[PDB]
Amino acid sequence: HAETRIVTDAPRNSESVGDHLFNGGVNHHDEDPDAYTKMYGPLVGYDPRNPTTLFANARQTGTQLVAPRKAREILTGIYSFEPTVLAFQREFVKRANAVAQPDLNSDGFSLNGLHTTFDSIRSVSGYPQWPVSALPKSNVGLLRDLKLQERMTARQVVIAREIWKRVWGHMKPTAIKIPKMSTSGPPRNVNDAEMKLQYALALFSGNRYNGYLDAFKSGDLSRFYRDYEAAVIMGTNVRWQVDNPGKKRDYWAQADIERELAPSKRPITTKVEINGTVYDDFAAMRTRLVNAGPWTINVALQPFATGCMNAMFELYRATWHPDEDKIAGFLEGKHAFFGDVSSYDHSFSEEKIDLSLEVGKEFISPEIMELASSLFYAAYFTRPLGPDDGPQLVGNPNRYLEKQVKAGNRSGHAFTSLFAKVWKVIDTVSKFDQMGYDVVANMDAILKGDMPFGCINNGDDEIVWFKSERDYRLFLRLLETQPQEQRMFKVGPEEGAVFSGSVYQLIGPLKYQAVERITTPFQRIICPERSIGGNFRKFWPLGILERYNKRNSHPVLEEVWRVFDDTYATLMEPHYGSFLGIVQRAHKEIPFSVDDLSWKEIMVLDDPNKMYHRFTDEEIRDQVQESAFRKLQPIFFERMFKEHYKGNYV
Ligand SMILES: [Mg+2]
Ligand SMILES: [Mg+2]
Ligand SMILES: [Mg+2]
Ligand SMILES: [Mg+2]
Ligand SMILES: [Mg+2]
């Protein structure tokens, strides 16, 4: 068929989606160019004078806060604002701190496996720090505050081009993941993976991908919206995590980002006060704004992000995807710096984002890179970030071909993870360069782990390793001496040498042993981001039982679990029932068993987005992946790649 539009002139909502189910073998939208139009309803309609109506049909609307205050159900029948729970938190933390204290050397390595104190467990889940910090229109104040370079050096640009050529220039075609449990974002704002899949099939049928790009590049939002159900705009969500009591933090106010491009931050002053009692020894949960790109934008980009990432994991495994179980042994006999990056994604400059996309255009049609740019710099809409704020549109989505919000490696983008991984390695390879090494001539060898130095990467987490002590101390001298003109990101040593959630305990001379942070099991039980069950914690017993079952695997861990069990038994059990009873009864009601799953699989059930950056299809069984994702195999977008990709297939 000739049809170039996803939404045609056919009557909408005239056929049931049940008559157009995807069989995994043929794209039925090739047979019927009107199918998508007929199986879904009329869009509400775009008003350029009122762009926020793009979100008026969402589950949460207008007035309701992005981060409401609401007690969490931490275990069956146990809620986080109850005074007995808070009493347990205080006593558990006293007793756990009496077990062990972090024992760190001058390089930040833990000698006992513990990297910090247990004080963050005095955080009240469901009690947010407010306001949630807004995203300013400009990150220049941050770049200034962090003392980052004004521009890349010439050499840094060379290195960035050499690495991006390797990344964009190779592709291992891989299925698009279609999330079951997240919103499509505008315009439909539904958690409907069937619609997402049918949209993908429509996009990749006939001439619709080129029609989509033509509509995009026209700058006519009314056209892109009408004919492709697409609008370049971010929604916003909030992520929550524990904090250390007493830690001073700051935030960008909604009223300031409205008035100023790069305003200064204001102090967060939230105190925990529950039913008329102040808890001065507790923290409110740290909160962070995350943007969310619409499905109907990200779907056009994801094939490239996923394919290039998967290629990179194969060709340059030693850098971007080593076996995590083997890292500690790999490091035996090596010196290592564990990177702690401050405000990483937000600290990317416009130059860095733009260069990445420029090199992309050598391998991928330029209009696709321009779509990526449009989303990186898109306007966003947020519901209120605090109790005194209103909903707010930041930027002008009517002018989406112009940059609206400059915020570095924008969250919610198809490319966010790829950019995080590649730029951390650009920075570290530039550091190898600044030491004096000839990194261009030896680029492949560095990335493949064949030189006497290299780096293991997981986005903003990294291990920079050296076979030679003298090379290692030269790297440390470089960090100490590096001037502003060379500084890409704000990086220091990680307290306790943590990588991907594990402490790399120093157990002998250049001998390491990985231990999951000993704070983690207790934070995730006692101070959770979300209540048990619901959308995101259906499988909550698994992570707990997995951790409990390995309690004897490390001597500090073992003692802290003994403190948990004894303290819970005395202070919680009389009122709420036994801990293991609650957890084991819940485990019986879910369709997975902890004994049958790998550690990787349990991680993915707790955080499915680890499939976009940490684990590949090969490492996770179908039943686990299918809990969270539908898939579209790459045969269904092969024609798009034949036209629009110019690199090498792996
Ligand atoms: Mg029928
Ligand atoms: Mg305080
Ligand atoms: Mg001012
Ligand atoms: Mg780190
Ligand atoms: Mg598999």
Side-chain angles (χ1 to χ4, degrees), residues 271-346:
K271 297 265 169 233
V272 177
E273 186 179 354
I274 301 171
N275 294 140
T277 302
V278 178
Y279 295 85
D280 277 319
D281 56 327
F282 280 74
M285 300 290 285
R286 199 167 162 200
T287 51
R288 74 177 173 97
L289 176 158
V290 178
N291 277 158
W295 178 253
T296 61
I297 309 301
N298 274 328
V299 67
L301 298 172
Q302 209 68 255
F304 297 98
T306 53
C308 290
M309 187 176 292
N310 276 268
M312 171 178 100
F313 282 6
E314 176 167 331
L315 296 176
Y316 303 115
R317 188 179 167 100
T319 297
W320 284 296
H321 200 60
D323 183 339
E324 293 184 23
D325 291 324
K326 291 193 167 159
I327 295 173
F330 174 82
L331 292 172
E332 199 180 355
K334 300 180 174 68
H335 304 261
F337 172 87
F338 283 67
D340 179 10
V341 187
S342 294
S343 302
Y344 179 51
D345 285 344
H346 202 187

Coordinates of all heavy atoms in Angstrom, one line a residue, residues 271-346:
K271 N 10.4 18.9 57.3 CA 10.6 18.1 58.5 C 9.6 17.0 58.6 O 8.5 17.2 58.0 CB 10.5 19.0 59.7 CG 11.5 20.2 59.8 CD 12.7 19.8 60.6 CE 13.9 20.8 60.5 NZ 15.2 20.0 60.2
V272 N 9.9 16.0 59.2 CA 8.9 14.9 59.4 C 8.0 15.2 60.6 O 8.5 15.2 61.8 CB 9.6 13.5 59.5 CG1 8.6 12.4 59.7 CG2 10.5 13.3 58.2
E273 N 6.8 15.4 60.3 CA 5.8 15.6 61.4 C 4.6 14.8 61.0 O 4.0 15.0 60.0 CB 5.5 17.1 61.6 CG 4.5 17.3 62.8 CD 4.1 18.7 63.1 OE1 4.6 19.6 62.4 OE2 3.3 18.9 64.0
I274 N 4.2 13.9 61.9 CA 3.2 12.9 61.6 C 2.2 12.9 62.7 O 2.6 12.7 63.8 CB 3.7 11.4 61.4 CG1 4.7 11.4 60.3 CG2 2.5 10.5 61.2 CD1 5.5 10.1 60.2
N275 N 0.9 13.2 62.4 CA -0.1 13.3 63.4 C 0.3 14.1 64.6 O 0.1 13.6 65.8 CB -0.6 11.9 63.7 CG -1.2 11.1 62.6 OD1 -1.0 9.9 62.4 ND2 -2.1 11.8 61.8
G276 N 0.9 15.2 64.4 CA 1.2 16.1 65.5 C 2.5 15.8 66.3 O 2.7 16.3 67.4
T277 N 3.3 14.8 65.9 CA 4.6 14.5 66.5 C 5.7 14.8 65.5 O 5.7 14.3 64.4 CB 4.6 13.0 66.9 OG1 3.5 12.8 67.8 CG2 5.9 12.6 67.6
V278 N 6.7 15.6 65.9 CA 7.9 15.8 65.1 C 8.9 14.7 65.3 O 9.3 14.4 66.5 CB 8.4 17.2 65.3 CG1 9.7 17.5 64.5 CG2 7.4 18.3 65.0
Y279 N 9.5 14.2 64.2 CA 10.5 13.2 64.2 C 11.8 13.8 63.7 O 12.2 13.6 62.5 CB 10.1 12.0 63.4 CG 8.9 11.3 64.0 CD1 7.6 11.7 63.7 CD2 9.1 10.2 64.8 CE1 6.5 11.1 64.2 CE2 8.0 9.6 65.4 CZ 6.7 10.0 65.1 OH 5.6 9.4 65.6
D280 N 12.5 14.5 64.6 CA 13.7 15.3 64.2 C 14.9 14.4 63.8 O 15.8 14.9 63.1 CB 14.2 16.3 65.3 CG 13.5 17.6 65.3 OD1 13.2 18.1 64.1 OD2 13.2 18.1 66.4
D281 N 14.9 13.1 64.2 CA 15.9 12.2 63.9 C 15.6 11.4 62.6 O 16.5 10.6 62.3 CB 16.1 11.3 65.1 CG 14.9 10.5 65.6 OD1 13.8 11.0 65.5 OD2 15.1 9.3 66.0
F282 N 14.5 11.7 62.0 CA 14.2 11.0 60.7 C 14.4 11.9 59.5 O 14.3 13.1 59.6 CB 12.8 10.5 60.7 CG 12.6 9.2 61.5 CD1 12.6 9.1 62.8 CD2 12.4 8.0 60.8 CE1 12.5 7.9 63.5 CE2 12.3 6.8 61.4 CZ 12.3 6.7 62.8
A283 N 14.6 11.3 58.3 CA 14.6 11.9 57.0 C 13.3 11.7 56.3 O 12.7 10.6 56.4 CB 15.7 11.3 56.1
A284 N 12.8 12.7 55.6 CA 11.8 12.5 54.5 C 12.6 11.9 53.3 O 13.8 12.1 53.2 CB 11.2 13.9 54.2
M285 N 11.8 11.1 52.5 CA 12.4 10.4 51.3 C 13.0 11.5 50.4 O 12.3 12.5 50.1 CB 11.4 9.6 50.6 CG 10.8 8.5 51.5 SD 12.1 7.2 51.9 CE 12.2 6.3 50.3
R286 N 14.1 11.3 49.8 CA 14.6 12.2 48.7 C 13.7 11.9 47.5 O 13.4 10.8 47.2 CB 16.0 11.8 48.4 CG 16.8 12.7 47.7 CD 18.3 12.3 47.8 NE 19.0 13.0 46.8 CZ 20.2 12.5 46.4 NH1 20.8 11.4 46.9 NH2 20.8 13.2 45.4
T287 N 13.4 13.0 46.8 CA 12.6 12.9 45.6 C 13.3 13.6 44.4 O 14.1 14.6 44.6 CB 11.2 13.6 45.9 OG1 11.4 14.9 46.4 CG2 10.4 12.8 46.8
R288 N 13.1 13.0 43.2 CA 13.7 13.5 42.0 C 12.8 13.4 40.8 O 12.1 12.4 40.6 CB 15.0 12.8 41.7 CG 15.0 11.5 41.3 CD 16.5 11.0 40.9 NE 16.4 9.6 40.6 CZ 16.3 9.2 39.4 NH1 16.5 9.9 38.3 NH2 16.1 7.8 39.2
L289 N 12.7 14.5 40.1 CA 11.9 14.6 38.9 C 12.6 13.8 37.8 O 13.8 14.0 37.5 CB 11.7 16.1 38.6 CG 11.0 16.4 37.3 CD1 10.4 17.9 37.4 CD2 11.8 16.3 36.1
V290 N 11.8 13.0 37.1 CA 12.2 12.3 35.9 C 11.2 12.6 34.8 O 10.0 12.6 35.0 CB 12.2 10.8 36.2 CG1 12.6 10.0 35.0 CG2 13.2 10.5 37.4
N291 N 11.7 12.9 33.6 CA 10.9 13.1 32.5 C 10.6 11.8 31.8 O 11.3 10.8 31.9 CB 11.5 14.1 31.5 CG 11.2 15.6 31.8 OD1 12.0 16.4 31.4 ND2 10.1 16.0 32.4
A292 N 9.5 11.8 31.0 CA 9.0 10.6 30.3 C 8.6 10.9 28.9 O 7.7 11.7 28.7 CB 7.8 9.9 31.1
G293 N 9.3 10.4 27.9 CA 9.0 10.6 26.5 C 7.8 9.8 26.1 O 7.6 8.7 26.6
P294 N 7.0 10.3 25.2 CA 5.8 9.6 24.7 C 6.3 8.4 23.9 O 7.3 8.5 23.2 CB 5.1 10.6 23.8 CG 5.7 11.9 24.2 CD 7.1 11.7 24.5
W295 N 5.5 7.3 24.0 CA 5.7 6.1 23.2 C 5.8 6.5 21.7 O 6.7 6.0 21.0 CB 4.6 5.1 23.4 CG 4.8 3.9 22.6 CD1 4.1 3.6 21.5 CD2 5.8 2.9 22.6 NE1 4.5 2.4 20.9 CE2 5.6 2.0 21.6 CE3 6.9 2.7 23.5 CZ2 6.5 0.9 21.4 CZ3 7.7 1.6 23.3 CH2 7.5 0.7 22.3
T296 N 4.9 7.3 21.2 CA 4.8 7.6 19.8 C 6.0 8.4 19.2 O 6.1 8.5 18.0 CB 3.4 8.2 19.4 OG1 3.2 9.4 20.1 CG2 2.3 7.2 19.7
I297 N 6.8 9.0 20.1 CA 8.1 9.5 19.8 C 9.2 8.5 20.0 O 10.0 8.2 19.0 CB 8.5 10.8 20.6 CG1 7.4 11.9 20.5 CG2 9.9 11.3 20.1 CD1 7.0 12.3 19.1
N298 N 9.4 7.9 21.1 CA 10.5 7.0 21.4 C 10.5 5.7 20.6 O 11.6 5.2 20.3 CB 10.5 6.6 22.9 CG 11.3 7.6 23.8 OD1 12.2 8.3 23.3 ND2 10.8 7.7 25.0
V299 N 9.3 5.2 20.1 CA 9.3 4.0 19.3 C 10.1 4.2 18.0 O 10.6 3.2 17.5 CB 7.8 3.6 19.0 CG1 7.1 4.6 18.2 CG2 7.8 2.1 18.4
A300 N 10.1 5.4 17.5 CA 10.8 5.7 16.2 C 12.3 5.7 16.4 O 13.1 5.4 15.4 CB 10.4 7.0 15.6
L301 N 12.8 5.8 17.6 CA 14.2 5.9 18.0 C 14.7 4.6 18.6 O 15.9 4.3 18.5 CB 14.4 7.1 19.0 CG 14.0 8.5 18.5 CD1 14.0 9.5 19.7 CD2 14.9 8.9 17.3
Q302 N 13.9 3.9 19.4 CA 14.4 2.7 20.1 C 15.1 1.7 19.3 O 16.1 1.1 19.8 CB 13.2 2.1 21.0 CG 13.7 1.4 22.2 CD 14.2 2.4 23.3 OE1 15.4 2.5 23.5 NE2 13.3 3.1 23.9
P303 N 14.7 1.4 18.0 CA 15.4 0.4 17.3 C 16.9 0.6 17.2 O 17.8 -0.3 17.3 CB 14.8 0.4 15.9 CG 13.4 0.9 16.1 CD 13.5 1.9 17.3
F304 N 17.3 1.9 17.0 CA 18.7 2.3 16.9 C 19.4 2.3 18.3 O 20.5 1.8 18.4 CB 18.8 3.7 16.4 CG 18.3 3.8 15.0 CD1 17.0 4.3 14.7 CD2 19.1 3.4 13.9 CE1 16.5 4.4 13.4 CE2 18.6 3.4 12.6 CZ 17.3 3.9 12.4
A305 N 18.7 2.7 19.3 CA 19.3 2.7 20.7 C 19.6 1.3 21.1 O 20.7 1.0 21.5 CB 18.3 3.4 21.7
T306 N 18.6 0.4 20.9 CA 18.7 -1.0 21.4 C 19.8 -1.7 20.5 O 20.6 -2.5 21.0 CB 17.4 -1.6 21.2 OG1 16.9 -1.4 19.9 CG2 16.4 -1.0 22.2
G307 N 19.7 -1.5 19.2 CA 20.6 -2.2 18.3 C 22.1 -1.8 18.5 O 23.0 -2.6 18.5
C308 N 22.3 -0.5 18.6 CA 23.7 0.0 18.8 C 24.2 -0.5 20.2 O 25.3 -0.9 20.4 CB 23.7 1.5 18.6 SG 23.5 2.0 16.9
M309 N 23.3 -0.4 21.3 CA 23.7 -0.9 22.6 C 24.1 -2.3 22.6 O 25.2 -2.7 23.1 CB 22.7 -0.6 23.6 CG 23.2 -0.9 25.0 SD 22.0 -0.5 26.3 CE 22.0 1.3 26.2
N310 N 23.3 -3.2 21.9 CA 23.6 -4.6 21.9 C 24.8 -4.9 21.1 O 25.6 -5.8 21.5 CB 22.3 -5.3 21.4 CG 21.3 -5.6 22.5 OD1 21.4 -6.7 23.1 ND2 20.4 -4.7 22.7
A311 N 25.1 -4.2 20.1 CA 26.4 -4.3 19.3 C 27.6 -4.0 20.2 O 28.6 -4.7 20.2 CB 26.4 -3.5 18.1
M312 N 27.5 -2.9 20.9 CA 28.5 -2.4 21.8 C 28.8 -3.4 22.9 O 30.0 -3.6 23.2 CB 28.0 -1.1 22.3 CG 28.8 -0.5 23.3 SD 28.0 1.2 23.7 CE 27.0 0.9 25.2
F313 N 27.8 -4.1 23.4 CA 28.0 -5.1 24.5 C 28.7 -6.3 23.9 O 29.4 -7.0 24.7 CB 26.6 -5.5 24.9 CG 25.8 -4.6 25.9 CD1 26.3 -3.4 26.3 CD2 24.6 -5.1 26.4 CE1 25.7 -2.6 27.2 CE2 24.0 -4.3 27.4 CZ 24.5 -3.1 27.7
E314 N 28.6 -6.6 22.7 CA 29.3 -7.7 22.0 C 30.7 -7.4 21.6 O 31.6 -8.0 22.0 CB 28.5 -8.2 20.8 CG 29.2 -9.3 20.1 CD 28.4 -10.0 19.1 OE1 27.1 -10.1 19.2 OE2 29.0 -10.6 18.2
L315 N 30.9 -6.3 20.9 CA 32.2 -5.9 20.4 C 33.1 -5.5 21.4 O 34.4 -5.7 21.3 CB 32.1 -4.9 19.3 CG 31.3 -5.3 18.0 CD1 31.2 -4.1 17.0 CD2 32.0 -6.4 17.3
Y316 N 32.6 -4.8 22.4 CA 33.4 -4.1 23.5 C 32.9 -4.5 24.9 O 32.8 -3.7 25.8 CB 33.3 -2.6 23.3 CG 33.8 -2.2 21.9 CD1 32.9 -1.6 21.0 CD2 35.1 -2.3 21.6 CE1 33.4 -1.2 19.7 CE2 35.6 -1.9 20.3 CZ 34.8 -1.4 19.4 OH 35.3 -1.0 18.2
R317 N 32.7 -5.9 25.0 CA 32.1 -6.5 26.2 C 32.9 -6.1 27.5 O 32.3 -5.8 28.5 CB 32.1 -8.0 26.0 CG 31.5 -8.7 27.2 CD 31.4 -10.2 27.0 NE 31.0 -10.8 28.3 CZ 29.8 -11.3 28.6 NH1 28.8 -11.2 27.7 NH2 29.6 -11.9 29.7
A318 N 34.3 -6.1 27.4 CA 35.1 -5.8 28.5 C 34.9 -4.5 29.2 O 35.1 -4.3 30.3 CB 36.6 -5.9 28.1
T319 N 34.4 -3.5 28.4 CA 34.0 -2.2 28.9 C 32.6 -2.2 29.3 O 32.3 -1.8 30.4 CB 34.3 -1.1 27.8 OG1 35.8 -1.1 27.5 CG2 33.8 0.2 28.3
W320 N 31.7 -2.5 28.4 CA 30.2 -2.2 28.7 C 29.4 -3.4 29.2 O 28.2 -3.1 29.6 CB 29.6 -1.6 27.4 CG 30.0 -0.1 27.2 CD1 29.7 0.9 28.1 CD2 30.8 0.4 26.2 NE1 30.1 2.1 27.6 CE2 30.9 1.8 26.4 CE3 31.4 -0.1 25.1 CZ2 31.5 2.7 25.6 CZ3 32.1 0.7 24.2 CH2 32.2 2.1 24.5
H321 N 29.8 -4.6 29.1 CA 29.0 -5.7 29.6 C 29.8 -6.9 30.0 O 29.5 -8.1 29.6 CB 28.1 -6.1 28.4 CG 26.9 -6.8 28.9 ND1 26.0 -6.3 29.8 CD2 26.4 -8.1 28.5 CE1 25.0 -7.2 30.0 NE2 25.2 -8.3 29.2
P322 N 30.7 -6.7 31.0 CA 31.4 -7.9 31.5 C 30.5 -8.7 32.4 O 29.5 -8.1 32.9 CB 32.6 -7.4 32.3 CG 32.1 -6.1 32.7 CD 31.3 -5.5 31.6
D323 N 30.8 -10.0 32.6 CA 30.0 -10.8 33.5 C 30.2 -10.2 34.9 O 31.3 -10.2 35.4 CB 30.6 -12.2 33.4 CG 29.8 -13.2 34.3 OD1 29.2 -12.8 35.3 OD2 29.9 -14.4 34.0
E324 N 29.1 -9.8 35.6 CA 29.3 -9.1 36.9 C 29.8 -10.0 38.0 O 30.6 -9.6 38.8 CB 27.9 -8.5 37.4 CG 27.5 -7.3 36.5 CD 26.2 -6.6 37.0 OE1 25.9 -6.7 38.2 OE2 25.5 -6.0 36.1
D325 N 29.5 -11.3 37.8 CA 30.0 -12.3 38.7 C 31.5 -12.5 38.7 O 32.0 -13.0 39.7 CB 29.3 -13.7 38.5 CG 27.8 -13.7 38.9 OD1 27.4 -13.0 39.9 OD2 27.0 -14.3 38.2
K326 N 32.1 -12.0 37.6 CA 33.5 -12.2 37.4 C 34.4 -11.0 37.7 O 35.6 -11.0 37.7 CB 33.8 -12.7 36.0 CG 33.3 -14.2 35.8 CD 33.8 -14.8 34.6 CE 33.6 -16.3 34.6 NZ 33.6 -16.8 33.2
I327 N 33.7 -9.8 38.0 CA 34.5 -8.6 38.1 C 35.5 -8.6 39.3 O 36.7 -8.2 39.1 CB 33.5 -7.4 38.3 CG1 32.7 -7.1 37.1 CG2 34.4 -6.1 38.7 CD1 31.6 -6.0 37.2
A328 N 35.1 -9.1 40.4 CA 36.1 -9.2 41.6 C 37.3 -10.0 41.2 O 38.5 -9.5 41.5 CB 35.4 -9.7 42.8
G329 N 37.1 -11.1 40.6 CA 38.3 -12.0 40.2 C 39.1 -11.3 39.1 O 40.4 -11.4 39.1
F330 N 38.5 -10.7 38.2 CA 39.1 -9.9 37.1 C 40.1 -8.8 37.7 O 41.2 -8.6 37.2 CB 38.1 -9.2 36.2 CG 38.7 -8.2 35.2 CD1 39.3 -8.7 34.0 CD2 38.8 -6.9 35.5 CE1 39.9 -7.9 33.1 CE2 39.4 -6.0 34.6 CZ 39.9 -6.5 33.4
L331 N 39.6 -8.2 38.8 CA 40.4 -7.2 39.5 C 41.6 -7.6 40.3 O 42.4 -6.8 40.7 CB 39.5 -6.2 40.3 CG 38.5 -5.4 39.5 CD1 37.6 -4.7 40.5 CD2 39.2 -4.3 38.6
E332 N 41.7 -8.9 40.6 CA 42.8 -9.5 41.4 C 44.1 -9.1 40.7 O 44.3 -9.3 39.5 CB 42.7 -11.0 41.5 CG 43.6 -11.4 42.7 CD 43.6 -12.9 43.0 OE1 42.8 -13.7 42.3 OE2 44.3 -13.4 43.9
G333 N 45.0 -8.4 41.5 CA 46.3 -8.0 41.0 C 46.3 -6.6 40.4 O 47.3 -6.1 40.0
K334 N 45.1 -6.0 40.3 CA 44.9 -4.6 39.7 C 44.6 -3.6 40.7 O 44.0 -3.9 41.7 CB 43.8 -4.6 38.7 CG 44.1 -5.6 37.5 CD 43.0 -5.5 36.5 CE 43.4 -6.4 35.3 NZ 43.4 -7.9 35.6
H335 N 45.0 -2.3 40.4 CA 44.6 -1.2 41.2 C 43.4 -0.6 40.5 O 43.2 -0.7 39.3 CB 45.7 -0.1 41.1 CG 47.0 -0.7 41.6 ND1 47.5 -0.4 42.9 CD2 48.0 -1.4 41.0 CE1 48.6 -1.0 43.1 NE2 49.0 -1.6 42.0
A336 N 42.5 0.0 41.3 CA 41.2 0.4 40.7 C 40.7 1.6 41.4 O 40.8 1.8 42.6 CB 40.2 -0.7 40.8
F337 N 40.2 2.6 40.6 CA 39.4 3.7 41.0 C 37.9 3.5 40.6 O 37.6 3.2 39.5 CB 40.0 5.0 40.3 CG 39.2 6.2 40.5 CD1 39.4 7.0 41.5 CD2 38.2 6.6 39.5 CE1 38.7 8.2 41.7 CE2 37.5 7.8 39.7 CZ 37.7 8.6 40.8
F338 N 37.1 3.7 41.6 CA 35.6 3.5 41.5 C 35.0 4.9 41.4 O 35.1 5.7 42.4 CB 35.1 2.7 42.7 CG 35.4 1.3 42.6 CD1 36.6 0.8 42.7 CD2 34.3 0.4 42.5 CE1 36.9 -0.6 42.6 CE2 34.6 -1.0 42.4 CZ 35.9 -1.5 42.5
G339 N 34.5 5.3 40.3 CA 33.9 6.6 40.0 C 32.6 6.9 40.6 O 31.6 6.1 40.5
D340 N 32.5 8.0 41.3 CA 31.2 8.6 41.9 C 31.0 10.0 41.2 O 31.8 10.9 41.4 CB 31.4 8.8 43.4 CG 30.2 9.5 44.1 OD1 29.1 9.6 43.5 OD2 30.4 9.8 45.2
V341 N 30.1 10.0 40.3 CA 29.8 11.2 39.5 C 28.6 11.9 40.1 O 27.6 11.3 40.4 CB 29.4 10.8 38.0 CG1 29.3 12.1 37.2 CG2 30.5 9.9 37.4
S342 N 28.8 13.2 40.2 CA 27.8 14.1 40.7 C 26.9 14.7 39.6 O 27.4 15.3 38.7 CB 28.4 15.3 41.5 OG 29.1 14.8 42.6
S343 N 25.6 14.6 39.8 CA 24.6 15.2 38.8 C 25.0 14.9 37.4 O 24.9 15.8 36.5 CB 24.5 16.7 39.1 OG 24.1 17.0 40.4
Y344 N 25.2 13.6 37.1 CA 25.8 13.2 35.8 C 25.0 13.6 34.6 O 25.5 14.4 33.8 CB 26.1 11.7 35.8 CG 26.6 11.2 34.5 CD1 27.8 11.7 33.9 CD2 26.1 10.1 33.9 CE1 28.3 11.2 32.8 CE2 26.7 9.5 32.7 CZ 27.8 10.1 32.2 OH 28.3 9.5 31.0
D345 N 23.8 13.1 34.5 CA 23.0 13.4 33.3 C 22.7 14.9 33.1 O 22.8 15.4 32.0 CB 21.7 12.6 33.3 CG 21.8 11.1 33.1 OD1 22.9 10.6 32.6 OD2 20.9 10.4 33.5
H346 N 22.4 15.6 34.1 CA 22.1 17.0 34.0 C 23.3 17.8 33.7 O 23.1 18.9 33.2 CB 21.4 17.5 35.3 CG 20.6 18.7 35.2 ND1 20.0 19.3 36.3 CD2 20.1 19.4 34.1 CE1 19.3 20.4 35.9 NE2 19.4 20.4 34.5

